[PDB]
Amino acid sequence: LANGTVMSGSHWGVFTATVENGRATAFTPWEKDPHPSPMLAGVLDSIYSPTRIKYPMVRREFLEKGVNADRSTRGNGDFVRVSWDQALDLVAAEVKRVEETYGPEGVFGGSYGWKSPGRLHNCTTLLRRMLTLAGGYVNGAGDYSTGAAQVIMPHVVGTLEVYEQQTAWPVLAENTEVMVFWAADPIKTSQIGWVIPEHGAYPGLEALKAKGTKVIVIDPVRTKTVEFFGAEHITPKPQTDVAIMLGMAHTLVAEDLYDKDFIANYTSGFDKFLPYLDGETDSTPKTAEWAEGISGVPAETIKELARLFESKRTMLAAGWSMQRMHHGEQAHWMLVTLASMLGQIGLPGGGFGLSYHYSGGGTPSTSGPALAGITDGGAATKGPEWLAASGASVIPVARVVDMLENPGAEFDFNGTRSKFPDVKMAYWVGGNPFVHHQDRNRMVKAWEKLETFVVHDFQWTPTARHADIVLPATTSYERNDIETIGDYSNTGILAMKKIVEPLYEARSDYDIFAAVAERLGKGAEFTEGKDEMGWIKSFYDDAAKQGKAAGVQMPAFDAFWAEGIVEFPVTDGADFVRYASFREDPLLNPLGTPTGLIEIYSKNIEKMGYDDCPAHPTWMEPLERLDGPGAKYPLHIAASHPFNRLHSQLNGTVLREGYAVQGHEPCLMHPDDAAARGIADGDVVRVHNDRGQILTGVKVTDAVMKGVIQIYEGGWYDPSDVTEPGTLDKYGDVNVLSADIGTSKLAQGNCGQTVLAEVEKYTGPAVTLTGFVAPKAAE
Ligand SMILES: NC1=NC(=O)C2=N[C@H]3C(S)=C(SO)[C@@H](COP(=O)(O)OP(=O)(O)OC[C@H]4O[C@@H](n5cnc6c(=O)[nH]c(N)nc65)[C@H](O)[C@@H]4O)O[C@H]3NC2=N1
Ligand SMILES: NC1=NC(=O)C2=N[C@H]3C(S)=C(S)[C@@H](COP(=O)(O)OP(=O)(O)OC[C@H]4O[C@@H](n5cnc6c(=O)[nH]c(N)nc65)[C@H](O)[C@@H]4O)O[C@H]3NC2=N1
Ligand SMILES: [Mo+6]
Ligand SMILES: [O]
């Protein structure tokens, strides 16, 4: 048995594992990581925890009746252990049956999910590689993060904007005077990366504090970001930020302070927005006093902030929770409109940034080459012969349940109309839709429309519990791979070396799909005749050839593997100022919009005629909001990202002990809201609305503003009885309470943070938690 140390990486960072007698016993952070995540211990534990999936399993009802199975019992845990050969034959037969019977429109292969980093063991791309060989599939478009903002931004500034490099951190330290974190908690959200994180925001935040820059945080919760800077903290009722921005803009116009020259030379449509702002069109001037009535933030505070932003070099760093809500397109559109009025876009340290809280945006980029990985093969094919009838080949990701309930119905998306395909099978790997998707009770019923649901994972998540066929995948730690360090920085390339042998009967997703492709008669097409190290070397060699041409020297493959990492030099990346070339010469460097300027009024959007996405930023009432006219429930749930999980990842580990309250997901509640209900710190409470009911454990704190409770997304749904409509969730999955609706007809994004509910002390029968131990038959 092996004894020694091995370096690898993950969504949480680079680390060194200690291995004793073939078992990983500790993960120690990379010595060069400026701010390791405390979650690393849970990553190690996830390899061995009680919910690790040991063997391939098939749901008993599905095994016995196939398409005639009772589908209401999915999730009850009645599984049968089968051999790998039996499972692979069945998965291949089902994929082929569905493709032959229903066509490519019958298979949903969007499989949204965060999976694990790695250029070879990319489970969702490998899934689509196999489904391409099987005949095709329906895919998903966009994501759950910036579903609204990524669609409105191309109409406003010309590009996606949310996933683009930001003005460098060092430029902010030397030039910014006022830093605003609007709906962003960078200390919490910068712990992880899509590719391996370099944790570059932490040194950046520390430099701002050492310089004494004024920091303002606009968030309903007193976060660690507020505490680290001792920031001025503004707490709006959730979903009212657009009203606040309009009050600020109105103030700038009324006091004649705004930058008329910036507006005249770099924007289009401000003259069509002015009448709305002044209330000529609806008899309602959008003053600071009007904004106070909706948001609860004092009118004078709104005015003083507006004046301060106009007189100092200000950076508006906005997060994405405020666009993960009804009419979410308006939030960043109005932010850019306000930023345009301030006139600092393109100046060092001024303007706005939509990725300072995510994956190190702002960390100086290196001059290194880009690393490529395995593909789905789609770009060198001739896929399905598709056409309306049979439905669209792609749907916005959050419309997956609408699709299942309404096959053949039309839907709007960014100016086009399409039809939902009639899906009969879904194959999900590296994702947890039974935690990440909204309105769990609606979804549970809608899933009965699928004949077959196949899942690969290494943990017994609610999604794996609901599958017809469950196959145990390996973790990154049981295989080899290669990946970039730094989504924006491109700090280097890491060898993700194998640490331990595969546990139990787990297999890589690559091996699983290669075996399914073999049963479809397409084995060589899937593998390309390469094995694990052959694939990895080919990606490295391609990057090295690209680096060579650019003047960046890289070692030969075996020398790189022996060192375990290669780092690239920073040349001019530390001086990057976003929008500087546009500001310098807008005629020579125009934006990719119809006019070449920032579009405050969009003629393109006006022509779509969508009632829920007007042609300029507009305040509209959402489905439900805190203190809204005729609102039924009294508390808004800040259903935001977890501090000590990456979504659902790591819920079934030792880390849960540190935050669970009587075994349930924690619920933060203000003292006054707790006192009114006779709730004490530590009590188990039932949180409910018209869509569902869940149990959580309360922590009383004035960190949340009055009227708001915090229940993070990611809790593992643990239904009392799967056959009972609206059954109580015993653990605390906040998506049992959210609504499943589109942000608007423009983007069709999810509204995961548009949620109101009531809370009462739970006095019902004692409940037993069953989500953190494997199903009995799977032991
Ligand atoms: N109410 C809500 N509020 C929100 O704010 C909210 N956030 C969104 C967002 S923003 C996202 S991501 O853009 C989704 C994340 O859902 P996801 O299914 O990616 O969550 P994970 O808990 O990270 O599921 C990943 C899944 O994958 C497994 N896995 C890891 N590596 C592998 C592998 O190599 N092979 C396989 N087969 N599986 C792997 C993990 O174990 C894990 O189970 O959430 C939205 N919802 C929100 N709602
Ligand atoms: N530790 C950690 N866990 C994760 O799960 C995680 N997920 C990653 C991913 S996939 C994403 S897409 C990003 C998400 O990055 P995103 O900015 O969407 O993060 P959230 O935690 O949903 O919201 C950030 C802040 O917005 C505040 N907020 C909520 N509603 C409102 C509102 O109406 N107005 C205002 N002004 N503020 C509001 C919340 O209180 C919270 O502090 O984080 C990434 N980083 C992550 N880190
Ligand atoms: Mo996301
Ligand atoms: O994401």
GROMACS .gro file of C-alpha atoms in nm, residues 42-438:
model
  397
   42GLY     CA    1  -1.488   1.843   0.316
   43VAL     CA    2  -1.352   1.769  -0.033
   44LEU     CA    3  -1.135   1.493   0.115
   45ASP     CA    4  -1.426   1.364   0.321
   46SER     CA    5  -1.651   1.345   0.010
   47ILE     CA    6  -1.432   1.063  -0.124
   48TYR     CA    7  -1.525   0.837   0.170
   49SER     CA    8  -1.841   0.970   0.336
   50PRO     CA    9  -2.144   0.751   0.403
   51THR     CA   10  -2.324   0.883   0.093
   52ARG     CA   11  -2.048   0.773  -0.148
   53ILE     CA   12  -2.216   0.560  -0.419
   54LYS     CA   13  -2.064   0.211  -0.417
   55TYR     CA   14  -2.231   0.013  -0.697
   56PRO     CA   15  -2.447   0.045  -1.010
   57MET     CA   16  -2.814   0.029  -0.914
   58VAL     CA   17  -3.146   0.007  -1.096
   59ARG     CA   18  -3.479   0.118  -0.947
   60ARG     CA   19  -3.680  -0.198  -0.873
   61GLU     CA   20  -3.999  -0.077  -1.047
   62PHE     CA   21  -3.801   0.018  -1.358
   63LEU     CA   22  -3.616  -0.315  -1.358
   64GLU     CA   23  -3.947  -0.503  -1.343
   65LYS     CA   24  -4.177  -0.289  -1.562
   66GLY     CA   25  -3.965  -0.059  -1.782
   67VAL     CA   26  -4.182   0.210  -1.944
   68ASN     CA   27  -4.487   0.075  -1.758
   69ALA     CA   28  -4.332   0.141  -1.416
   70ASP     CA   29  -4.515   0.345  -1.153
   71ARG     CA   30  -4.319   0.670  -1.181
   72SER     CA   31  -4.454   0.836  -0.866
   73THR     CA   32  -4.225   0.623  -0.648
   74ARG     CA   33  -3.898   0.761  -0.791
   75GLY     CA   34  -3.689   0.873  -0.492
   76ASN     CA   35  -3.818   0.623  -0.234
   77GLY     CA   36  -3.484   0.436  -0.236
   78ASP     CA   37  -3.611   0.098  -0.358
   79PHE     CA   38  -3.308   0.003  -0.567
   80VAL     CA   39  -3.157  -0.326  -0.685
   81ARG     CA   40  -2.779  -0.375  -0.713
   82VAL     CA   41  -2.677  -0.499  -1.058
   83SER     CA   42  -2.349  -0.589  -1.227
   84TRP     CA   43  -2.174  -0.329  -1.445
   85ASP     CA   44  -2.230  -0.539  -1.758
   86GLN     CA   45  -2.605  -0.556  -1.686
   87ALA     CA   46  -2.625  -0.182  -1.621
   88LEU     CA   47  -2.430  -0.085  -1.935
   89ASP     CA   48  -2.639  -0.314  -2.157
   90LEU     CA   49  -2.955  -0.154  -2.017
   91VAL     CA   50  -2.837   0.206  -2.055
   92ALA     CA   51  -2.724   0.142  -2.413
   93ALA     CA   52  -3.054  -0.031  -2.502
   94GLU     CA   53  -3.258   0.255  -2.358
   95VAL     CA   54  -3.056   0.525  -2.534
   96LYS     CA   55  -3.102   0.338  -2.863
   97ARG     CA   56  -3.474   0.268  -2.806
   98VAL     CA   57  -3.549   0.634  -2.738
   99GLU     CA   58  -3.342   0.755  -3.034
  100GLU     CA   59  -3.513   0.510  -3.273
  101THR     CA   60  -3.865   0.558  -3.138
  102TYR     CA   61  -3.870   0.933  -3.079
  103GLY     CA   62  -3.568   1.078  -3.263
  104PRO     CA   63  -3.305   1.310  -3.113
  105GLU     CA   64  -3.586   1.536  -2.987
  106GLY     CA   65  -3.670   1.259  -2.736
  107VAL     CA   66  -3.340   1.281  -2.542
  108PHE     CA   67  -3.256   1.572  -2.311
  109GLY     CA   68  -2.877   1.601  -2.280
  110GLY     CA   69  -2.840   1.954  -2.140
  111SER     CA   70  -2.728   1.802  -1.809
  112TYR     CA   71  -2.658   2.138  -1.643
  113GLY     CA   72  -2.405   2.121  -1.361
  114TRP     CA   73  -2.083   2.228  -1.193
  115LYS     CA   74  -1.917   1.883  -1.208
  116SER     CA   75  -1.540   1.897  -1.140
  117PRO     CA   76  -1.259   2.074  -1.332
  118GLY     CA   77  -1.041   1.884  -1.580
  119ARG     CA   78  -0.995   1.894  -1.958
  120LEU     CA   79  -1.029   1.519  -2.013
  121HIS     CA   80  -1.273   1.406  -1.741
  122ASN     CA   81  -1.539   1.663  -1.834
  123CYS     CA   82  -1.848   1.453  -1.771
  124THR     CA   83  -2.107   1.676  -1.941
  125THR     CA   84  -1.899   1.713  -2.257
  126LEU     CA   85  -1.839   1.334  -2.256
  127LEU     CA   86  -2.213   1.277  -2.223
  128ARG     CA   87  -2.281   1.494  -2.530
  129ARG     CA   88  -1.996   1.320  -2.716
  130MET     CA   89  -2.176   0.986  -2.665
  131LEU     CA   90  -2.525   1.122  -2.741
  132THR     CA   91  -2.394   1.274  -3.066
  133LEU     CA   92  -2.288   0.921  -3.168
  134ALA     CA   93  -2.627   0.783  -3.063
  135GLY     CA   94  -2.818   1.018  -3.298
  136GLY     CA   95  -2.848   1.354  -3.123
  137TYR     CA   96  -3.007   1.527  -2.826
  138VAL     CA   97  -3.180   1.840  -2.700
  139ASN     CA   98  -2.937   2.080  -2.528
  140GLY     CA   99  -2.971   2.370  -2.285
  141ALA     CA  100  -2.860   2.730  -2.341
  142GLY     CA  101  -2.738   2.992  -2.094
  143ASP     CA  102  -2.700   2.916  -1.724
  144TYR     CA  103  -2.859   2.964  -1.379
  145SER     CA  104  -2.606   3.234  -1.281
  146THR     CA  105  -2.652   3.522  -1.523
  147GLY     CA  106  -2.951   3.390  -1.717
  148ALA     CA  107  -3.097   3.739  -1.755
  149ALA     CA  108  -2.784   3.956  -1.758
  150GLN     CA  109  -2.602   3.754  -2.027
  151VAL     CA  110  -2.893   3.813  -2.269
  152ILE     CA  111  -2.961   4.183  -2.199
  153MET     CA  112  -2.593   4.286  -2.198
  154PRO     CA  113  -2.526   4.216  -2.571
  155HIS     CA  114  -2.815   4.457  -2.651
  156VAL     CA  115  -2.675   4.726  -2.417
  157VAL     CA  116  -2.295   4.712  -2.436
  158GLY     CA  117  -2.253   4.465  -2.725
  159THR     CA  118  -2.092   4.164  -2.554
  160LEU     CA  119  -2.185   3.919  -2.275
  161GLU     CA  120  -1.995   4.133  -2.020
  162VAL     CA  121  -2.049   3.907  -1.718
  163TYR     CA  122  -1.774   3.657  -1.808
  164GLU     CA  123  -1.512   3.903  -1.936
  165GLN     CA  124  -1.193   4.029  -1.771
  166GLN     CA  125  -1.237   4.324  -1.536
  167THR     CA  126  -1.024   4.635  -1.480
  168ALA     CA  127  -0.723   4.491  -1.292
  169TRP     CA  128  -0.714   4.489  -0.911
  170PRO     CA  129  -0.391   4.694  -0.892
  171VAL     CA  130  -0.552   4.966  -1.107
  172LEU     CA  131  -0.837   4.987  -0.855
  173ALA     CA  132  -0.593   5.016  -0.563
  174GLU     CA  133  -0.411   5.311  -0.719
  175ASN     CA  134  -0.714   5.496  -0.860
  176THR     CA  135  -1.051   5.410  -0.704
  177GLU     CA  136  -1.180   5.637  -0.429
  178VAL     CA  137  -1.520   5.477  -0.366
  179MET     CA  138  -1.574   5.100  -0.414
  180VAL     CA  139  -1.936   4.980  -0.419
  181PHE     CA  140  -2.026   4.612  -0.380
  182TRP     CA  141  -2.385   4.603  -0.509
  183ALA     CA  142  -2.554   4.266  -0.442
  184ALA     CA  143  -2.208   4.106  -0.423
  185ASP     CA  144  -2.025   3.928  -0.140
  186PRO     CA  145  -1.679   3.867  -0.286
  187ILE     CA  146  -1.531   3.725   0.033
  188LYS     CA  147  -1.791   3.445   0.026
  189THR     CA  148  -1.811   3.377  -0.349
  190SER     CA  149  -1.441   3.403  -0.444
  191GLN     CA  150  -1.354   3.072  -0.269
  192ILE     CA  151  -1.421   2.868  -0.581
  193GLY     CA  152  -1.344   2.871  -0.952
  194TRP     CA  153  -1.491   2.704  -1.264
  195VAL     CA  154  -1.138   2.595  -1.354
  196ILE     CA  155  -0.890   2.579  -1.056
  197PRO     CA  156  -0.912   2.910  -0.863
  198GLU     CA  157  -0.609   3.125  -0.781
  199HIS     CA  158  -0.807   3.317  -0.513
  200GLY     CA  159  -0.684   3.644  -0.669
  201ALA     CA  160  -0.961   3.861  -0.525
  202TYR     CA  161  -0.825   3.831  -0.168
  203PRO     CA  162  -0.496   4.019  -0.218
  204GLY     CA  163  -0.702   4.267  -0.426
  205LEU     CA  164  -0.950   4.327  -0.142
  206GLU     CA  165  -0.667   4.356   0.113
  207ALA     CA  166  -0.496   4.627  -0.095
  208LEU     CA  167  -0.818   4.833  -0.106
  209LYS     CA  168  -0.845   4.815   0.272
  210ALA     CA  169  -0.480   4.912   0.324
  211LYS     CA  170  -0.528   5.218   0.100
  212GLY     CA  171  -0.826   5.339   0.306
  213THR     CA  172  -1.067   5.348   0.008
  214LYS     CA  173  -1.429   5.417   0.106
  215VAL     CA  174  -1.632   5.095   0.068
  216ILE     CA  175  -2.010   5.079   0.039
  217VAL     CA  176  -2.203   4.750   0.045
  218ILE     CA  177  -2.566   4.733  -0.076
  219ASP     CA  178  -2.709   4.403   0.048
  220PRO     CA  179  -2.993   4.291   0.279
  221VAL     CA  180  -2.740   4.085   0.480
  222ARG     CA  181  -2.440   4.199   0.688
  223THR     CA  182  -2.186   3.979   0.509
  224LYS     CA  183  -1.817   3.910   0.569
  225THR     CA  184  -1.754   4.165   0.292
  226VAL     CA  185  -1.918   4.432   0.512
  227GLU     CA  186  -1.724   4.315   0.820
  228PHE     CA  187  -1.381   4.302   0.652
  229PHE     CA  188  -1.397   4.665   0.537
  230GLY     CA  189  -1.615   4.809   0.817
  231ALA     CA  190  -1.819   4.924   0.519
  232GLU     CA  191  -2.108   5.166   0.504
  233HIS     CA  192  -2.398   4.920   0.477
  234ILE     CA  193  -2.719   4.993   0.289
  235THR     CA  194  -3.000   4.737   0.327
  236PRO     CA  195  -3.270   4.755   0.059
  237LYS     CA  196  -3.578   4.532   0.072
  238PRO     CA  197  -3.478   4.255  -0.171
  239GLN     CA  198  -3.592   4.310  -0.531
  240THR     CA  199  -3.605   4.692  -0.506
  241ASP     CA  200  -3.254   4.786  -0.627
  242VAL     CA  201  -3.387   4.919  -0.960
  243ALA     CA  202  -3.612   5.162  -0.771
  244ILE     CA  203  -3.307   5.285  -0.575
  245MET     CA  204  -3.105   5.329  -0.895
  246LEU     CA  205  -3.389   5.531  -1.052
  247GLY     CA  206  -3.406   5.755  -0.743
  248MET     CA  207  -3.029   5.816  -0.774
  249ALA     CA  208  -3.060   5.895  -1.146
  250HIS     CA  209  -3.354   6.129  -1.080
  251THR     CA  210  -3.145   6.312  -0.819
  252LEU     CA  211  -2.857   6.351  -1.066
  253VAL     CA  212  -3.093   6.504  -1.324
  254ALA     CA  213  -3.281   6.729  -1.081
  255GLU     CA  214  -2.961   6.875  -0.931
  256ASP     CA  215  -2.806   6.897  -1.279
  257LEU     CA  216  -2.501   6.696  -1.173
  258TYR     CA  217  -2.482   6.417  -1.432
  259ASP     CA  218  -2.220   6.398  -1.706
  260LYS     CA  219  -2.397   6.544  -2.011
  261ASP     CA  220  -2.086   6.509  -2.229
  262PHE     CA  221  -2.046   6.138  -2.156
  263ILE     CA  222  -2.416   6.081  -2.229
  264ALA     CA  223  -2.400   6.279  -2.555
  265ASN     CA  224  -2.091   6.114  -2.702
  266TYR     CA  225  -2.099   5.755  -2.574
  267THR     CA  226  -2.465   5.657  -2.531
  268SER     CA  227  -2.784   5.626  -2.734
  269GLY     CA  228  -3.143   5.680  -2.625
  270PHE     CA  229  -3.110   5.888  -2.308
  271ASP     CA  230  -3.369   6.133  -2.448
  272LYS     CA  231  -3.628   5.851  -2.461
  273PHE     CA  232  -3.549   5.750  -2.101
  274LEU     CA  233  -3.567   6.104  -1.950
  275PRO     CA  234  -3.947   6.142  -1.981
  276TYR     CA  235  -3.996   5.813  -1.795
  277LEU     CA  236  -3.755   5.915  -1.519
  278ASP     CA  237  -3.930   6.252  -1.477
  279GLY     CA  238  -4.277   6.092  -1.477
  280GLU     CA  239  -4.406   6.255  -1.796
  281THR     CA  240  -4.522   5.916  -1.927
  282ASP     CA  241  -4.692   5.773  -1.616
  283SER     CA  242  -4.749   6.068  -1.381
  284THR     CA  243  -4.493   5.925  -1.137
  285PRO     CA  244  -4.162   6.107  -1.107
  286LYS     CA  245  -3.904   5.847  -0.994
  287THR     CA  246  -3.769   6.062  -0.709
  288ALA     CA  247  -3.564   5.948  -0.410
  289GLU     CA  248  -3.884   5.981  -0.201
  290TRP     CA  249  -4.071   5.751  -0.441
  291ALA     CA  250  -3.778   5.504  -0.418
  292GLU     CA  251  -3.786   5.518  -0.038
  293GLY     CA  252  -4.154   5.413  -0.039
  294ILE     CA  253  -4.066   5.097  -0.234
  295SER     CA  254  -3.720   5.006  -0.102
  296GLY     CA  255  -3.730   5.132   0.259
  297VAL     CA  256  -3.397   5.315   0.214
  298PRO     CA  257  -3.414   5.677   0.332
  299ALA     CA  258  -3.456   5.933   0.054
  300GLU     CA  259  -3.169   6.145   0.190
  301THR     CA  260  -2.935   5.844   0.190
  302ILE     CA  261  -3.028   5.776  -0.172
  303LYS     CA  262  -2.950   6.139  -0.262
  304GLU     CA  263  -2.620   6.150  -0.070
  305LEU     CA  264  -2.495   5.831  -0.234
  306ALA     CA  265  -2.580   5.972  -0.580
  307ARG     CA  266  -2.381   6.290  -0.510
  308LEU     CA  267  -2.086   6.094  -0.369
  309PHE     CA  268  -2.064   5.861  -0.669
  310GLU     CA  269  -2.062   6.161  -0.905
  311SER     CA  270  -1.783   6.347  -0.723
  312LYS     CA  271  -1.533   6.064  -0.661
  313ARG     CA  272  -1.372   5.795  -0.882
  314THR     CA  273  -1.628   5.519  -0.820
  315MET     CA  274  -1.635   5.152  -0.921
  316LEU     CA  275  -1.976   4.981  -0.917
  317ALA     CA  276  -1.900   4.611  -0.863
  318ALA     CA  277  -2.232   4.429  -0.897
  319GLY     CA  278  -2.312   4.066  -0.818
  320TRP     CA  279  -2.575   3.843  -0.977
  321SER     CA  280  -2.840   3.770  -0.714
  322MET     CA  281  -3.041   4.075  -0.817
  323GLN     CA  282  -3.083   3.945  -1.177
  324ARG     CA  283  -3.176   3.592  -1.050
  325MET     CA  284  -3.528   3.728  -0.997
  326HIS     CA  285  -3.843   3.833  -1.186
  327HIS     CA  286  -3.760   4.104  -1.443
  328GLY     CA  287  -3.391   4.042  -1.368
  329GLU     CA  288  -3.286   4.198  -1.701
  330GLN     CA  289  -3.363   4.544  -1.562
  331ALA     CA  290  -3.111   4.529  -1.274
  332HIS     CA  291  -2.779   4.541  -1.466
  333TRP     CA  292  -2.933   4.741  -1.753
  334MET     CA  293  -3.022   5.015  -1.503
  335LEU     CA  294  -2.681   4.980  -1.334
  336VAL     CA  295  -2.505   5.050  -1.666
  337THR     CA  296  -2.745   5.341  -1.726
  338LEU     CA  297  -2.655   5.488  -1.387
  339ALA     CA  298  -2.284   5.427  -1.459
  340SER     CA  299  -2.322   5.611  -1.791
  341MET     CA  300  -2.471   5.911  -1.608
  342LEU     CA  301  -2.167   5.916  -1.375
  343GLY     CA  302  -1.940   5.933  -1.680
  344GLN     CA  303  -1.643   5.729  -1.559
  345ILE     CA  304  -1.671   5.423  -1.784
  346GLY     CA  305  -1.326   5.363  -1.932
  347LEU     CA  306  -1.134   5.564  -1.671
  348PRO     CA  307  -0.879   5.385  -1.454
  349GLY     CA  308  -1.065   5.268  -1.143
  350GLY     CA  309  -1.407   5.398  -1.254
  351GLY     CA  310  -1.716   5.252  -1.423
  352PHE     CA  311  -1.871   4.915  -1.338
  353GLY     CA  312  -1.767   4.549  -1.322
  354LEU     CA  313  -1.987   4.239  -1.322
  355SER     CA  314  -1.730   3.974  -1.228
  356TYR     CA  315  -1.524   4.095  -0.927
  357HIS     CA  316  -1.701   3.836  -0.709
  358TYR     CA  317  -1.658   3.539  -0.943
  359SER     CA  318  -1.359   3.320  -1.029
  360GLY     CA  319  -1.092   3.587  -0.974
  361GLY     CA  320  -1.220   3.849  -1.221
  362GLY     CA  321  -0.973   4.138  -1.206
  363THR     CA  322  -0.668   3.920  -1.130
  364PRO     CA  323  -0.405   4.021  -1.388
  365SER     CA  324  -0.398   3.793  -1.691
  366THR     CA  325  -0.073   3.628  -1.797
  367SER     CA  326   0.060   3.595  -2.152
  368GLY     CA  327   0.030   3.215  -2.146
  369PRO     CA  328  -0.152   2.999  -2.400
  370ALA     CA  329  -0.505   2.862  -2.371
  371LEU     CA  330  -0.552   2.495  -2.285
  372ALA     CA  331  -0.808   2.293  -2.483
  373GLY     CA  332  -0.980   1.967  -2.385
  374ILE     CA  333  -1.201   1.687  -2.516
  375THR     CA  334  -1.491   1.797  -2.734
  376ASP     CA  335  -1.839   1.660  -2.802
  377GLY     CA  336  -1.737   1.624  -3.169
  378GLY     CA  337  -2.034   1.834  -3.288
  379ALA     CA  338  -1.820   2.082  -3.494
  380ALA     CA  339  -1.684   1.812  -3.728
  381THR     CA  340  -2.004   1.619  -3.787
  382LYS     CA  341  -2.339   1.660  -3.962
  383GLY     CA  342  -2.572   1.601  -3.668
  384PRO     CA  343  -2.948   1.555  -3.687
  385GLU     CA  344  -3.168   1.679  -3.969
  386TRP     CA  345  -3.383   1.912  -3.759
  387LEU     CA  346  -3.680   2.139  -3.822
  388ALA     CA  347  -3.974   2.296  -3.633
  389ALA     CA  348  -4.223   2.016  -3.557
  390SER     CA  349  -4.030   1.786  -3.313
  391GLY     CA  350  -3.939   2.113  -3.127
  392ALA     CA  351  -3.631   2.334  -3.088
  393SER     CA  352  -3.298   2.154  -3.045
  394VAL     CA  353  -3.199   2.395  -2.765
  395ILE     CA  354  -3.402   2.544  -2.475
  396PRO     CA  355  -3.306   2.806  -2.213
  397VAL     CA  356  -3.182   2.589  -1.924
  398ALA     CA  357  -3.440   2.694  -1.665
  399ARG     CA  358  -3.737   2.607  -1.891
  400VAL     CA  359  -3.674   2.232  -1.850
  401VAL     CA  360  -3.994   2.170  -1.647
  402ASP     CA  361  -4.204   2.398  -1.874
  403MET     CA  362  -4.075   2.181  -2.162
  404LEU     CA  363  -4.183   1.858  -1.993
  405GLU     CA  364  -4.532   1.990  -1.911
  406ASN     CA  365  -4.592   2.150  -2.252
  407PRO     CA  366  -4.443   1.952  -2.542
  408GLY     CA  367  -4.504   2.132  -2.873
  409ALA     CA  368  -4.602   2.466  -2.712
  410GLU     CA  369  -4.427   2.782  -2.831
  411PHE     CA  370  -4.199   2.996  -2.613
  412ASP     CA  371  -4.034   3.334  -2.672
  413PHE     CA  372  -3.659   3.389  -2.644
  414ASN     CA  373  -3.460   3.699  -2.740
  415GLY     CA  374  -3.693   3.797  -3.026
  416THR     CA  375  -3.755   3.449  -3.170
  417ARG     CA  376  -4.034   3.196  -3.113
  418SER     CA  377  -3.956   2.825  -3.083
  419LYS     CA  378  -4.139   2.504  -2.993
  420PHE     CA  379  -4.063   2.276  -2.699
  421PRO     CA  380  -3.950   1.928  -2.809
  422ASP     CA  381  -4.129   1.617  -2.675
  423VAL     CA  382  -3.864   1.465  -2.447
  424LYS     CA  383  -3.895   1.111  -2.314
  425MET     CA  384  -3.555   1.051  -2.151
  426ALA     CA  385  -3.307   1.265  -1.955
  427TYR     CA  386  -2.946   1.172  -1.883
  428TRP     CA  387  -2.779   1.380  -1.611
  429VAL     CA  388  -2.415   1.375  -1.501
  430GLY     CA  389  -2.224   1.627  -1.287
  431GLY     CA  390  -2.536   1.820  -1.184
  432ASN     CA  391  -2.809   1.812  -0.920
  433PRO     CA  392  -3.138   1.940  -1.066
  434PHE     CA  393  -3.336   1.795  -0.771
  435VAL     CA  394  -3.158   2.065  -0.566
  436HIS     CA  395  -3.076   2.339  -0.821
  437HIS     CA  396  -3.408   2.376  -1.006
  438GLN     CA  397  -3.702   2.583  -0.878
   0.00000   0.00000   0.00000
